[PDB]
């Protein structure tokens, strides 16, 4: 989530974060709910866009 890259053995990883749709929820700047796979565009900065892969915090 920080933006860095790491290399670790498969054993060291804790576990997959299995999250239900009731847990993986995203809200945009305006407050409209955005779900998995939707396309959003960055409001500022590079103003890039893409499809959501996973939502966390």
């Amino acid at each position: 989530s920080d933006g860095k890259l790491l290399s670790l053995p498969p054993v060291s990883i804790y576990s997959k974060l299995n999250l239900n749709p009731n847990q993986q929820i995203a809200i945009d700047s305006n407050g409209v709910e955005v779900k998995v796979g939707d396309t959003v565009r960055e409001f500022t900065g590079e103003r890039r866009q893409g499809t959501i892969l996973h939502v966390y915090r």
Binding site: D2, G3, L8, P9, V11, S12, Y14, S15, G45, E46
Partner: protein
């Protein structure tokens, strides 16, 4: 200083936002906060920011060295000589400044790295410094018989697994509770397992992956308080068997390690997790040793 990449990428949520516009930060205070300087260096290496070291009294040193070097003549020839000397001195300063800046930067980097190394060493030592749980009416260092109960998640369809280990460190019996943990049947079966089979565990450990485990912990504590399940003491206020939460980084890593699979080829993953919890309670140091390489991935 900020590059265009720094001008665009340093967001209010990014960890680099703490020094987006820092200025005139004292060097002597940096050693007390090594992580700030390390993060500044990391941001610099990303092509976002530029770290600059400057002296408020640089002009004072330049003027003093010029006064030492300059001639005292007043003729126009002496004026030309002094001008040539001063210009060469300024060029020498221009050449010299970057090397001194780099040397000071490397010195502060080494100091901050050593400070953070010692800090991490102390944190790890604090993490791994804990003797095994001492049951009452026993001397310190005695290995207690332990019982671990866990169900993992608590979704509809989550049975509670129980694993008991003696002081010898060898698994004695594993049991499944297939009824609901809130039913009277669950409590009755757990009481029968605790009492009838002469298991007599010295401490009971409870752990899980979410907040659903809290309800199990409360239910177990209520059951212990209700049935007066006092510890058996080898031959009189008999003491109750303690029920606590257990830290489970080593257990989580052990449930995925192939060492457990070789040790227990016909056991479920939750059984391995409970065994890891029990072994951690018996001896945290040996469990931390069992991590081998994965211990370096722990949040220290």
């Amino acid at each position: 200083e900020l590059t265009e990449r720094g001008k665009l990428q340093i967001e209010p949520e990014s960890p680099y936002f703490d020094f987006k516009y820092a200025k005139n930060r004292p060097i002597s205070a940096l050693t007390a906060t090594p992580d700030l300087y390390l993060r500044m260096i990391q941001a610099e290496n990303d092509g976002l920011v530029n770290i600059k070291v400057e002296l408020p009294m640089l002009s004072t040193v330049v003027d003093h060295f010029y006064n030492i070097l300059k001639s005292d003549g007043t003729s126009e020839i002496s004026e030309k000589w002094n001008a040539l000397r001063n210009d060469a001195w300024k060029q020498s300063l221009d050449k010299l400044i970057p090397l001194v800046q780099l040397n000071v930067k490397e010195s502060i980097r080494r100091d901050c790295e050593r400070v953070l190394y010692f800090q991490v060493k102390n944190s790890f030592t604090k993490k791994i410094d804990q003797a095994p749980y001492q049951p009452p009416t026993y001397a310190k260092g005695t290995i207690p018989r332990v019982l671990t109960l866990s169900f993992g998640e608590g979704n509809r369809g989550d049975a509670v697994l129980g694993v008991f280990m003696d002081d010898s460190g060898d698994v004695k019996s594993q049991i499944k509770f297939d009824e609901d943990f809130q039913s009277r049947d669950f409590s009755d079966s757990l009481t029968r397992y605790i009492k009838s089979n002469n298991i007599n565990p010295d401490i009971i450990g409870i752990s899980g992956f979410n907040i659903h485990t809290k309800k199990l912990f409360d239910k177990v504590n209520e059951l212990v308080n209700e049935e007066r399940l006092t510890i058996e003491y080898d031959n009189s206020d008999k003491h109750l068997i303690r029920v606590i939460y257990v830290n489970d980084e080593t257990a989580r890593l052990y449930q995925h390690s192939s060492k457990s699979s070789a040790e227990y080829p016909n056991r479920p993953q939750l059984a391995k997790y409970c065994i890891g919890l029990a072994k951690y309670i018996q001896s945290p140091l040996l469990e931390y040793l069992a991590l081998d390489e994965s211990m370096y991935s722990l949040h220290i």
